[PDB]
Design a protein around this ligand. Structure first.
Ligand SMILES: CCC(=O)Nc1cc(Nc2cc(NC3CC3)n3ncc(C#N)c3n2)ccc1C
Length: 327
C-alpha cells in the first residue's frame, strides 16, 4: 500500500465530471482560422507546428493529434481545461478540428524557447533558483488539481530566457491521481523515470514528478545533462544506484514489498551511497551551495513518500534569494 502525502483525495472531493474525462465533450472550433508556418517537432501520436491565427494575427503552437484512442485526446483536453490559468502551465487557447476530416488539434500559446542544451550552459546560480522555483509553481498547481504530469524533462519546460517566462508543456502523458490506483509505469523519458517506474511499482503518485524535477536540478547545478544517463531501463536503475547506493535501494524495495526483476542480479553490483559533494569541480562550483545539495538530497530519494512535495521544495532555503528578490 502507498498513498500520496498531499492532495491524495482531491479528485474524490470534486464533482465526478472533473476527473471523468471519458465523459468530457470538448467544444471543437474551426482549424481553418490557423495558418501553419513551420514544423516544430512530433510525438508518437502528434505533430507540432508554429502557426498564425489569421483572424487576429496571434502566433500559436498547433498540435495535430494523429490516430490515437479518442480517450487519450479527451484526457489531455480535460486536464488542460482543469488547469486553466494555472501558474506557469502552458495556456490552451483553442480546441479545433479540420471541418472535413474531423482530425482534432490543440492550439497553445507560443513561447520563444531557448534550446535547453544551449541554455543550461549559461545559467547562473540565481537563474537556476529562479527557473526551478517557477517550475515548482507549475507542479504544485497541477498536483493541487489532482494531476500528475508524468513527463517532466527539459524538453517539456519551455523557457524564454529573454522575457524570463517558463511554461510546463506536453500534458499528453498526464493523469488524474486516485488513491490506491495502479498506473502504467511506461511513462516519462528514460533519464527522468523515478525508481518506482524502473522497478515496476504501479501505486505511484505526484512524487514521481518530484524525482524528475530533482534530476533536472542535478543536471543544472552539476552541468551533467542528463544527470542519470542509462542506456536502457535496466541500466537506468544501475546509474541511480551507483549514486544513491544499493543498500538504500533494497531498503526501499523491502518497505513496499517490491519484487525486483531478476535480470538486475547480473548488473546492479554493490555501491555505496555517494556524497553529493563528489560531483563538484571547478566547472560547476559556482552553481553549488550547501542549500542546493540539501534540497537535491531531499528530492532524489528512492522512497517516493520521503521526497519533498512541490510546495515543500518551494519553501526550501535554496529559494530564499528568489522570494526576497520578488518582494
Ligand atoms: C503542443 C506541443 C506539445 O505538447 N509537445 C511538443 C512541443 C514541441 N515544441 C514546442 C516549441 C515551442 N517554442 C519553441 C519554438 C520556439 N513551444 N511554445 C509553446 C509550446 C507548447 N505547447 C511549444 N512547443 C515539439 C514537439 C512536441 C511533441
Amino acid at each position: 500500500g502507498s498513498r500520496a502525502r498531499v492532495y491524495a483525495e482531491v479528485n474524490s472531493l470534486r464533482s465526478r465530471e472533473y476527473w471523468d474525462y471519458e465523459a468530457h465533450v470538448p467544444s471543437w472550433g474551426n482549424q481553418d482560422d490557423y495558418q501553419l508556418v513551420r514544423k516544430l517537432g512530433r510525438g508518437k501520436y502528434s505533430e507540432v507546428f508554429e502557426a498564425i491565427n489569421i483572424t487576429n494575427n496571434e502566433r500559436v503552437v498547433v498540435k495535430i493529434l494523429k490516430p490515437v484512442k479518442k480517450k487519450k485526446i479527451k484526457r489531455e483536453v480535460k486536464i488542460l481545461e482543469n488547469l486553466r490559468g494555472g501558474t506557469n502551465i502552458i495556456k490552451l487557447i483553442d480546441t479545433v478540428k479540420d471541418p472535413v476530416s474531423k482530425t482534432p488539434a490543440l492550439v497553445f500559446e507560443y513561447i520563444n524557447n531557448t534550446d535547453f542544451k544551449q541554455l543550461y550552459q549559461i545559467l547562473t546560480d540565481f537563474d537556476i533558483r529562479f527557473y526551478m522555483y517557477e517550475l515548482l509553481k507549475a507542479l504544485d498547481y497541477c498536483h493541487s488539481k489532482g494531476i500528475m504530469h508524468r513527463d517532466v524533462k527539459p524538453h517539456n519546460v519551455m523557457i524564454d530566457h529573454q522575457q524570463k517566462k517558463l511554461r510546463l508543456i506536453d500534458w499528453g502523458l498526464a493523469e488524474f491521481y486516485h488513491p490506491a490506483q495502479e498506473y502504467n509505469v511506461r511513462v516519462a523519458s528514460r533519464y527522468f523515470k523515478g525508481p518506482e517506474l524502473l522497478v515496476d511499482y504501479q501505486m505511484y503518485d505526484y512524487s514521481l514528478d518530484m524525482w524528475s524535477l530533482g534530476c533536472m536540478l542535478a543536471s543544472m547545478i552539476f552541468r551533467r545533462e542528463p544527470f542519470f544517463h542509462g542506456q536502457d531501463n535496466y541500466d537506468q536503475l544501475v546509474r541511480i544506484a551507483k549514486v544513491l547506493g544499493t543498500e538504500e535501494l533494497y531498503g526501499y524495495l523491502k518497505k513496499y514489498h517490491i519484487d525486483l526483476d531478476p535480470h538486475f542480479n547480473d548488473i546492479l553490483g554493490q555501491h555505496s551511497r555517494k556524497r553529493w559533494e563528489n560531483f563538484i569541480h571547478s566547472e560547476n562550483r559556482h552553481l553549488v551551495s550547501p542549500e542546493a545539495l540539501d534540497l537535491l538530497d531531499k528530492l532524489l530519494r528512492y522512497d517516493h513518500q520521503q521526497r519533498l512535495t512541490a510546495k515543500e521544495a518551494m519553501e526550501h532555503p535554496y529559494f530564499y534569494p528568489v522570494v526576497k528578490e520578488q518582494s
